Symmetry: D2
Subunit: 164 residues, 4 copies
Amino acid sequence: ERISEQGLYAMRDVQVARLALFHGDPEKAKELTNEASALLSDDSTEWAKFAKPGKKTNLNDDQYIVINASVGISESYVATPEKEAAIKIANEKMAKGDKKGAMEELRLAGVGVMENQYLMPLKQTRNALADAQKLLDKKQYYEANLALKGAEDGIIVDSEALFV
Amino acid sequence: ERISEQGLYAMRDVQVARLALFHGDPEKAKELTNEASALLSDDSTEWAKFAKPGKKTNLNDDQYIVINASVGISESYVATPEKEAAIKIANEKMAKGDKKGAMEELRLAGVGVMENQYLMPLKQTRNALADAQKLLDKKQYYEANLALKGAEDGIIVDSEALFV
Amino acid sequence: RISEQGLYAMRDVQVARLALFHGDPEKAKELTNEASALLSDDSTEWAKFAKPGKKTNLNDDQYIVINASVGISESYVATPEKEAAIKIANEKMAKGDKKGAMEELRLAGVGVMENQYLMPLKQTRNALADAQKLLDKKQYYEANLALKGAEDGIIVDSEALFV
Amino acid sequence: RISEQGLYAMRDVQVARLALFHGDPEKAKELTNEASALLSDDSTEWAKFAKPGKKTNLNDDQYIVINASVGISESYVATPEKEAAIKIANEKMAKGDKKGAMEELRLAGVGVMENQYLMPLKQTRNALADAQKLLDKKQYYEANLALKGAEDGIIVDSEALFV
């Protein structure tokens, strides 16, 4: 994976924190927001290893960080002998680690394969968590929920044809 | 209003497994699929305790299991003295754990709050994972990816107004 | 049934938010007025499109069905039993026997959901009215947020089809 | 530039999938015929709506922009600086200086994305042709899956607006 596990866990923490605020548990929300902030602010983390260059951020000098990924499949689902043969060869090539050859066989049988990457703008997200922490410290719990929502709103999905 | 962390962990395994079939190790895909299947097949988990009762399933005698939850906020984002006064009171009741009274105060402020629950049909999902395990055993990797996709496709969202 | 007035109103909202940020507030104002008019028709039988039993944030509001889609879940494994079930289901669909067709698929391990998009009617009218006041005051960014609030009221409700 | 032709075609596909499972195959066939005709109509200047630099699965294909929406990210904390930037951005929107307006927001911590929905033209034409063959053979469940495959080719591409 080129997925940043720290960014993935941080955003999962934000989701649970926002729900905690509406279930009368600000203390859990505060602890989770602190965990998320610390996950994104480590000096040892090599964020460049997870960055998506070429995706321009709203903040200058910021970068989008890959924090999750999924596979997207498109096809007709019609079984033909030719498509079954292509899939058999694709499976063969994938077993041998020939990922690029496997994808070529799938694509000629009408299968589209995308990698969906979930992208987090690093400094923009840190700034939103910092705003949330200040509000939590002042017990402005609804407002903290909105700042956390703003962090979630910065996450985008980018889909790219795999091995094309 | 409790989430099955076991079901959520299983479905997260499924997502990683599908991508590994195209982009990582098929051996890791098999291991993740075995783990997801074992988590869902474990009846030491008290599944009924996490079920959503009034949601009819596709299989007879199945149940939807709550495996994730999030908050959805609707409002205009326009500040007024009346609204800020009501939000201040909402925050005070949140601090005292009065989650119902806090929600009544937010509705005075013009805020709509939903809880989104992600629902997993347990036996239907078990069946899809079992199909994927059979395919992976035969090195039918693309087909296994579709069986896992079918598992993901059974997850639905149900949204309900929080504490009305 | 699906409310095409609600469907068109929320489509107008989406286009209006884009128009504001492409430097066309006039187009956004026209579209927001159209959406307001679609949701305030005196002679729309809204109860015909309502989703009762879905509790709203506002007291005595109602959710309106404004869109729908089909969701299919299966494992894509071909067997003789499954192909035979699909053939029977297709024959039932050809005859208009929609309920039997879906039951035949479910018995073969195919899940068919109806995904309904639900609009809270009075809540959405209120959001549009807030956006109109901001547009009148030339508060265009703020109006874009108010329209976003109207969009965030739309929820999805999925039910097994003809179950 | 959004392709209204492509958007209409994909909306037809959604309704067709619903019609198949609500016992109306003739309506689904009519809707699928219309979607195929719209996408095959080369009097539409498809290249004018294409998203350059986005690689498709098929060798000589192109992604067509068929829909777009706005996404706003901010922390909702009112500060004198942000409130002044919103005032300036609103003035630039009113003058049609759309790029300066988004830059003003960006520099005050308000991020605006444009989300574009992208349709791979030849790939989508191919998926509809597959569905047509199935509909002609009365293979209605299979046609529903082939139409689902057409929808699954639509992707979202988000970019900072006028950055």
